[PDB]
Structures are given as structure tokens and as C-alpha cells.
Design a protein around this nucleic acid. Structure first.
Length: 180
DNA sequence: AAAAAAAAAAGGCGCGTATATAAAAGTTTCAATGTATCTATAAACCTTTGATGTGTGTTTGTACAT
């Protein structure tokens, strides 16, 4: 392989443990996008770490755009601190990353036609809307989006580690299906 | 001939085309349930019309003044 699956989004859940006044949360924040007509969750974008989070009336926050487990975790801790400054005793309790989506590259042109045709059972293709293949692995259970540019979009894991394992499993397939 | 307002016109903002990831909230759609509202329909009445025993009626025989 020799290629790290480069994460582009990490979505995580944080139980602040309080019924947050989403109106006051929006009011006391600096740049927060909350109005009920789209969702029941204040969405805040913090530039450091730059993450976008929706926090619900349950006080549960789901965070996206992180580049690491620690980007999301530190961002969520900052989010809880911001909520506490707002006035609600937010606390980092029973945190869990619900999604780790990444894009990386293997850089060798691929016979995507070969894979999809011979892995019709596993991968399906209708190249007249979107030129990417969809592949599944159960161990680890990662779904992977493949495009001729070599871009690999690995999704379906709470951790980047399942991303890494399925990438170490799928890059050999890619090189096998490398078009030249 | 000169001043002012709208259109002619394009390129790009920015997310629909996929697009899967997952939690978080909510909607709408589907089907069983409930109900007043059609209807026929045969079972209620009212009137009709053909068949009907018989009250009244033609012969028999009568006490009864005449």
C-alpha cells in the first residue's frame, strides 16, 4: 500500500448532559447558525479545530469535517466549554465518533470496468450519472467509493483504523485492477 | 441632441445529478376503524277487483174474519 487513507470528515457524538437552550446557545455564540426551520440543532463552525457541529435539544452534538479523532475530540471539548460559557454545564461524557470518512489516492489508473463487471455481485455501475464504483468489505466493514482519478473515498467506520485496514486490503485489489 | 433605466448577456455560486457514513428530528403515507349517507327491498297500508253466501224474494199452503 504505502498510502495512508487521508480522512476528510469525522462525525462524532458528544453527550453534554444538559437540555441546552438552543436559542440561548445561538444567542451567546460568536458565529453559530441555528434556526428551527432546518433542524433542532445549533450548528457551530469553530475554525480551531475547524469543525461543523449540530447540537440538539437532547444536548447531543454530532461533529463533522474533523481531520482526526483528536480534531473532533478537542473541537467537542471546546464546544462544551463554549456551551458552559453560554451557561449550560456541558460535559464530555460517553463521546463516540459515529463516522470517519476519508479521501486518499493510489494514483495508478484503474480498470474500474474490470472490477465492476467481474464484481457486479459486489459492485454496481451505471456510468451515466456518476463515474464511481461502490465496494463493500465486512472485515473491516468499510464501503469504498472508487474513481478513475485514483481517489479512494473510504467510509463506514467509527475509527480511521478500520479505514486503514480495509485500505490495506483494497489497495492490492486496486493495483491488481490498475489500468495502464 | 442629451439624460436615465432595464435588458442583453456570462460566468460563476452553489448545491440537484450520484454518493454512503452515521447518529440526531419529523412527515407523510397507508391501512384498520368508525360513521352518516346513498340505495334497494321486501315488508308495512290502502285501494282495487274477481269470486261469494246469502237477505230478500216467487210458489205453496195457511186460520180467518170476511
Amino acid at each position: 500500500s504505502g498510502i495512508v487513507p487521508t480522512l476528510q470528515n469525522i462525525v462524532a457524538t458528544v453527550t453534554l448532559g444538559c437540555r441546552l437552550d438552543l436559542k440561548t446557545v445561538a444567542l451567546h455564540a460568536r458565529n453559530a447558525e441555528y434556526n428551527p426551520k432546518r433542524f433542532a440543532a445549533v450548528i457551530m463552525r469553530i475554525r480551531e479545530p475547524k469543525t461543523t457541529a449540530l447540537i440538539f435539544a437532547s444536548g447531543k452534538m454530532v461533529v463533522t469535517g474533523a481531520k482526526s479523532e483528536d480534531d473532533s475530540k478537542l473541537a467537542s471539548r471546546k464546544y462544551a466549554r463554549i456551551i458552559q460559557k453560554i451557561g449550560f454545564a456541558a460535559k464530555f461524557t460517553d463521546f463516540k465518533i459515529q463516522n470517519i470518512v476519508g479521501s486518499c489516492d493510489v494514483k495508478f489508473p484503474i480498470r474500474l470496468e474490470g472490477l465492476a463487471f467481474s464484481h457486479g455481485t459486489f459492485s454496481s455501475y451505471e456510468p451515466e450519472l456518476f463515474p464511481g464504483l461502490i465496494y463493500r468489505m465486512v472485515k473491516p466493514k468499510i464501503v469504498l467509493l472508487i474513481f478513475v482519478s485514483g481517489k479512494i473515498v473510504l467510509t463506514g467506520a467509527k475509527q480511521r483504523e478500520e479505514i486503514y485496514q480495509a485500505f490495506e486490503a483494497i489497495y492490492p485489489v486496486l493495483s491488481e485492477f490498475r489500468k495502464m
